[PDB]
């Protein structure tokens, strides 16, 4: 009860100290050469990022861990804008995230082994979101073959689009718990953390593939959109021009979908008008 909270304070402040000082100095790299031996704290940082409960976070207490990711992101960012990324770029990338990470997590199709899987799934998704927050994610992005970052577009489909569908065996449709809701949202944010997916995304939408059930049939894309509505339409809005042009023109023989998706565009656009005014007027003009 006390040793934890103490050392939690201590790590949080040492991280804060590093970032706000060993970086805010314009020639702080000389200080880095003074605090030369730091690989230790790098691994501590990354262990917190990846498995916070191991160190300090171990309290799980809402006020402290609320600010923990913010500090982590800021420190990560500082290490970006400063040199000495090699230790970052290596010691973080090649250890807490890899290609095999997504597949080796992807194996358990939300199995009854509940207390196990979505744990590390969520750990990874939170961590990667935090990375993108710091925007060092692309350094963890491995080299691919096409402008479309298969790295994450593929995990999109192979985790949800294939994942949500039991049509490969015509078994019972897997109901989603709020656990599944939040996990899916995280995965979607992941997919959308990388530019150049939306076209594939609408392809995943405007697909006349039909799901089976319970005997009724309903278009799989309709399920996918109806379920993850807010995140989808959000991201579609995030690149409104490209999505609009593709929705209009790449789409033929599309009655239900194109309608519904455009309505959703308009809707979730209006839903947030106090937040901004330059988002829908442009959407209106385009469509």
JSON list of C-alpha atoms in Angstrom, two decimals, residues 80-188:
[
{"chain": "A", "resi": 80, "resn": "UNK", "atom": "CA", "xyz": [11.83, 12.01, -30.55]},
{"chain": "A", "resi": 81, "resn": "UNK", "atom": "CA", "xyz": [12.61, 15.68, -31.03]},
{"chain": "A", "resi": 82, "resn": "UNK", "atom": "CA", "xyz": [15.97, 15.01, -29.48]},
{"chain": "A", "resi": 83, "resn": "UNK", "atom": "CA", "xyz": [18.63, 12.66, -30.81]},
{"chain": "A", "resi": 84, "resn": "UNK", "atom": "CA", "xyz": [19.40, 9.40, -29.02]},
{"chain": "A", "resi": 85, "resn": "UNK", "atom": "CA", "xyz": [16.46, 7.79, -30.83]},
{"chain": "A", "resi": 86, "resn": "UNK", "atom": "CA", "xyz": [18.56, 4.78, -31.83]},
{"chain": "A", "resi": 87, "resn": "UNK", "atom": "CA", "xyz": [18.22, 3.28, -28.36]},
{"chain": "A", "resi": 88, "resn": "UNK", "atom": "CA", "xyz": [14.59, 4.33, -28.48]},
{"chain": "A", "resi": 89, "resn": "UNK", "atom": "CA", "xyz": [14.06, 3.08, -32.04]},
{"chain": "A", "resi": 90, "resn": "UNK", "atom": "CA", "xyz": [15.64, -0.26, -31.25]},
{"chain": "A", "resi": 91, "resn": "UNK", "atom": "CA", "xyz": [15.02, -1.07, -27.63]},
{"chain": "A", "resi": 92, "resn": "UNK", "atom": "CA", "xyz": [11.36, -0.20, -28.00]},
{"chain": "A", "resi": 93, "resn": "UNK", "atom": "CA", "xyz": [10.49, -1.35, -31.49]},
{"chain": "A", "resi": 94, "resn": "UNK", "atom": "CA", "xyz": [12.18, -4.68, -31.78]},
{"chain": "A", "resi": 95, "resn": "UNK", "atom": "CA", "xyz": [10.94, -5.76, -28.34]},
{"chain": "A", "resi": 96, "resn": "UNK", "atom": "CA", "xyz": [7.48, -4.44, -27.43]},
{"chain": "A", "resi": 97, "resn": "UNK", "atom": "CA", "xyz": [5.96, -4.58, -30.90]},
{"chain": "A", "resi": 98, "resn": "UNK", "atom": "CA", "xyz": [6.57, -6.77, -33.92]},
{"chain": "A", "resi": 99, "resn": "UNK", "atom": "CA", "xyz": [4.74, -8.30, -36.84]},
{"chain": "A", "resi": 100, "resn": "UNK", "atom": "CA", "xyz": [4.28, -11.50, -34.86]},
{"chain": "A", "resi": 101, "resn": "UNK", "atom": "CA", "xyz": [2.64, -9.51, -32.07]},
{"chain": "A", "resi": 102, "resn": "UNK", "atom": "CA", "xyz": [-0.59, -8.92, -33.95]},
{"chain": "A", "resi": 103, "resn": "UNK", "atom": "CA", "xyz": [-0.95, -12.48, -35.24]},
{"chain": "A", "resi": 104, "resn": "UNK", "atom": "CA", "xyz": [0.15, -14.19, -32.03]},
{"chain": "A", "resi": 105, "resn": "UNK", "atom": "CA", "xyz": [-2.49, -12.12, -30.29]},
{"chain": "A", "resi": 106, "resn": "UNK", "atom": "CA", "xyz": [-4.99, -12.73, -33.07]},
{"chain": "A", "resi": 107, "resn": "UNK", "atom": "CA", "xyz": [-5.16, -16.48, -32.44]},
{"chain": "A", "resi": 108, "resn": "UNK", "atom": "CA", "xyz": [-7.79, -16.57, -29.70]},
{"chain": "A", "resi": 109, "resn": "UNK", "atom": "CA", "xyz": [-11.08, -15.66, -31.37]},
{"chain": "A", "resi": 110, "resn": "UNK", "atom": "CA", "xyz": [-12.39, -13.97, -28.22]},
{"chain": "A", "resi": 111, "resn": "UNK", "atom": "CA", "xyz": [-12.38, -17.36, -26.58]},
{"chain": "A", "resi": 112, "resn": "UNK", "atom": "CA", "xyz": [-13.98, -18.28, -23.26]},
{"chain": "A", "resi": 113, "resn": "UNK", "atom": "CA", "xyz": [-10.50, -17.72, -21.83]},
{"chain": "A", "resi": 114, "resn": "UNK", "atom": "CA", "xyz": [-11.71, -14.20, -21.08]},
{"chain": "A", "resi": 115, "resn": "UNK", "atom": "CA", "xyz": [-9.39, -13.13, -18.24]},
{"chain": "A", "resi": 116, "resn": "UNK", "atom": "CA", "xyz": [-6.44, -13.69, -20.56]},
{"chain": "A", "resi": 117, "resn": "UNK", "atom": "CA", "xyz": [-6.79, -12.58, -24.15]},
{"chain": "A", "resi": 118, "resn": "UNK", "atom": "CA", "xyz": [-8.32, -9.16, -24.27]},
{"chain": "A", "resi": 119, "resn": "UNK", "atom": "CA", "xyz": [-5.94, -8.16, -21.53]},
{"chain": "A", "resi": 120, "resn": "UNK", "atom": "CA", "xyz": [-2.86, -8.16, -23.72]},
{"chain": "A", "resi": 121, "resn": "UNK", "atom": "CA", "xyz": [-4.90, -7.18, -26.73]},
{"chain": "A", "resi": 122, "resn": "UNK", "atom": "CA", "xyz": [-5.92, -4.04, -24.88]},
{"chain": "A", "resi": 123, "resn": "UNK", "atom": "CA", "xyz": [-2.41, -3.51, -23.60]},
{"chain": "A", "resi": 124, "resn": "UNK", "atom": "CA", "xyz": [-1.09, -3.49, -27.13]},
{"chain": "A", "resi": 125, "resn": "UNK", "atom": "CA", "xyz": [-3.84, -1.27, -28.45]},
{"chain": "A", "resi": 126, "resn": "UNK", "atom": "CA", "xyz": [-3.51, 1.32, -25.73]},
{"chain": "A", "resi": 127, "resn": "UNK", "atom": "CA", "xyz": [0.25, 1.31, -26.15]},
{"chain": "A", "resi": 128, "resn": "UNK", "atom": "CA", "xyz": [0.13, 1.76, -29.89]},
{"chain": "A", "resi": 129, "resn": "UNK", "atom": "CA", "xyz": [-2.40, 4.53, -29.57]},
{"chain": "A", "resi": 130, "resn": "UNK", "atom": "CA", "xyz": [-0.09, 6.21, -27.13]},
{"chain": "A", "resi": 131, "resn": "UNK", "atom": "CA", "xyz": [2.76, 5.78, -29.59]},
{"chain": "A", "resi": 132, "resn": "UNK", "atom": "CA", "xyz": [0.79, 7.45, -32.35]},
{"chain": "A", "resi": 133, "resn": "UNK", "atom": "CA", "xyz": [-0.03, 10.15, -29.87]},
{"chain": "A", "resi": 134, "resn": "UNK", "atom": "CA", "xyz": [3.69, 10.64, -29.56]},
{"chain": "A", "resi": 135, "resn": "UNK", "atom": "CA", "xyz": [3.86, 9.98, -33.26]},
{"chain": "A", "resi": 136, "resn": "UNK", "atom": "CA", "xyz": [6.86, 7.72, -33.11]},
{"chain": "A", "resi": 137, "resn": "UNK", "atom": "CA", "xyz": [4.59, 4.91, -34.29]},
{"chain": "A", "resi": 138, "resn": "UNK", "atom": "CA", "xyz": [5.81, 4.97, -37.88]},
{"chain": "A", "resi": 139, "resn": "UNK", "atom": "CA", "xyz": [9.27, 4.24, -36.61]},
{"chain": "A", "resi": 140, "resn": "UNK", "atom": "CA", "xyz": [7.72, 1.04, -35.25]},
{"chain": "A", "resi": 141, "resn": "UNK", "atom": "CA", "xyz": [5.96, 0.73, -38.59]},
{"chain": "A", "resi": 142, "resn": "UNK", "atom": "CA", "xyz": [7.95, -1.89, -40.53]},
{"chain": "A", "resi": 143, "resn": "UNK", "atom": "CA", "xyz": [8.68, -1.57, -44.23]},
{"chain": "A", "resi": 144, "resn": "UNK", "atom": "CA", "xyz": [5.89, -2.89, -46.44]},
{"chain": "A", "resi": 145, "resn": "UNK", "atom": "CA", "xyz": [5.34, -3.57, -50.14]},
{"chain": "A", "resi": 146, "resn": "UNK", "atom": "CA", "xyz": [2.50, -1.17, -51.04]},
{"chain": "A", "resi": 147, "resn": "UNK", "atom": "CA", "xyz": [1.56, 2.38, -50.05]},
{"chain": "A", "resi": 148, "resn": "UNK", "atom": "CA", "xyz": [-1.30, 0.76, -48.16]},
{"chain": "A", "resi": 149, "resn": "UNK", "atom": "CA", "xyz": [0.26, -0.19, -44.83]},
{"chain": "A", "resi": 150, "resn": "UNK", "atom": "CA", "xyz": [-0.80, -3.81, -44.85]},
{"chain": "A", "resi": 151, "resn": "UNK", "atom": "CA", "xyz": [0.68, -3.94, -41.35]},
{"chain": "A", "resi": 152, "resn": "UNK", "atom": "CA", "xyz": [-2.50, -2.61, -39.90]},
{"chain": "A", "resi": 153, "resn": "UNK", "atom": "CA", "xyz": [-5.05, -2.68, -42.67]},
{"chain": "A", "resi": 154, "resn": "UNK", "atom": "CA", "xyz": [-4.63, -6.43, -42.79]},
{"chain": "A", "resi": 155, "resn": "UNK", "atom": "CA", "xyz": [-4.96, -6.71, -39.04]},
{"chain": "A", "resi": 156, "resn": "UNK", "atom": "CA", "xyz": [-8.17, -4.71, -39.34]},
{"chain": "A", "resi": 157, "resn": "UNK", "atom": "CA", "xyz": [-9.90, -7.30, -41.46]},
{"chain": "A", "resi": 158, "resn": "UNK", "atom": "CA", "xyz": [-8.22, -10.35, -39.98]},
{"chain": "A", "resi": 159, "resn": "UNK", "atom": "CA", "xyz": [-9.15, -9.25, -36.46]},
{"chain": "A", "resi": 160, "resn": "UNK", "atom": "CA", "xyz": [-12.63, -7.81, -36.93]},
{"chain": "A", "resi": 161, "resn": "UNK", "atom": "CA", "xyz": [-13.96, -8.17, -40.48]},
{"chain": "A", "resi": 162, "resn": "UNK", "atom": "CA", "xyz": [-13.10, -11.80, -40.53]},
{"chain": "A", "resi": 163, "resn": "UNK", "atom": "CA", "xyz": [-13.35, -11.78, -36.75]},
{"chain": "A", "resi": 164, "resn": "UNK", "atom": "CA", "xyz": [-16.92, -10.60, -36.42]},
{"chain": "A", "resi": 165, "resn": "UNK", "atom": "CA", "xyz": [-18.15, -13.04, -39.02]},
{"chain": "A", "resi": 166, "resn": "UNK", "atom": "CA", "xyz": [-18.89, -16.70, -38.26]},
{"chain": "A", "resi": 167, "resn": "UNK", "atom": "CA", "xyz": [-19.97, -17.13, -41.90]},
{"chain": "A", "resi": 168, "resn": "UNK", "atom": "CA", "xyz": [-16.99, -19.38, -42.62]},
{"chain": "A", "resi": 169, "resn": "UNK", "atom": "CA", "xyz": [-18.85, -22.09, -40.70]},
{"chain": "A", "resi": 170, "resn": "UNK", "atom": "CA", "xyz": [-22.47, -20.80, -40.53]},
{"chain": "A", "resi": 171, "resn": "UNK", "atom": "CA", "xyz": [-22.41, -21.15, -36.75]},
{"chain": "A", "resi": 172, "resn": "UNK", "atom": "CA", "xyz": [-24.08, -18.91, -34.18]},
{"chain": "A", "resi": 173, "resn": "UNK", "atom": "CA", "xyz": [-23.25, -15.23, -34.47]},
{"chain": "A", "resi": 174, "resn": "UNK", "atom": "CA", "xyz": [-20.95, -14.23, -31.59]},
{"chain": "A", "resi": 175, "resn": "UNK", "atom": "CA", "xyz": [-22.61, -11.59, -29.43]},
{"chain": "A", "resi": 176, "resn": "UNK", "atom": "CA", "xyz": [-20.33, -8.74, -28.39]},
{"chain": "A", "resi": 177, "resn": "UNK", "atom": "CA", "xyz": [-19.91, -7.65, -24.79]},
{"chain": "A", "resi": 178, "resn": "UNK", "atom": "CA", "xyz": [-18.91, -4.13, -23.85]},
{"chain": "A", "resi": 179, "resn": "UNK", "atom": "CA", "xyz": [-15.49, -5.69, -23.60]},
{"chain": "A", "resi": 180, "resn": "UNK", "atom": "CA", "xyz": [-15.81, -6.49, -27.28]},
{"chain": "A", "resi": 181, "resn": "UNK", "atom": "CA", "xyz": [-17.13, -3.02, -27.95]},
{"chain": "A", "resi": 182, "resn": "UNK", "atom": "CA", "xyz": [-14.14, -1.30, -26.41]},
{"chain": "A", "resi": 183, "resn": "UNK", "atom": "CA", "xyz": [-11.66, -3.77, -27.92]},
{"chain": "A", "resi": 184, "resn": "UNK", "atom": "CA", "xyz": [-13.09, -3.23, -31.36]},
{"chain": "A", "resi": 185, "resn": "UNK", "atom": "CA", "xyz": [-12.92, 0.51, -30.91]},
{"chain": "A", "resi": 186, "resn": "UNK", "atom": "CA", "xyz": [-9.28, 0.22, -30.01]},
{"chain": "A", "resi": 187, "resn": "UNK", "atom": "CA", "xyz": [-8.55, -1.91, -33.04]},
{"chain": "A", "resi": 188, "resn": "UNK", "atom": "CA", "xyz": [-10.34, 0.56, -35.27]}
]
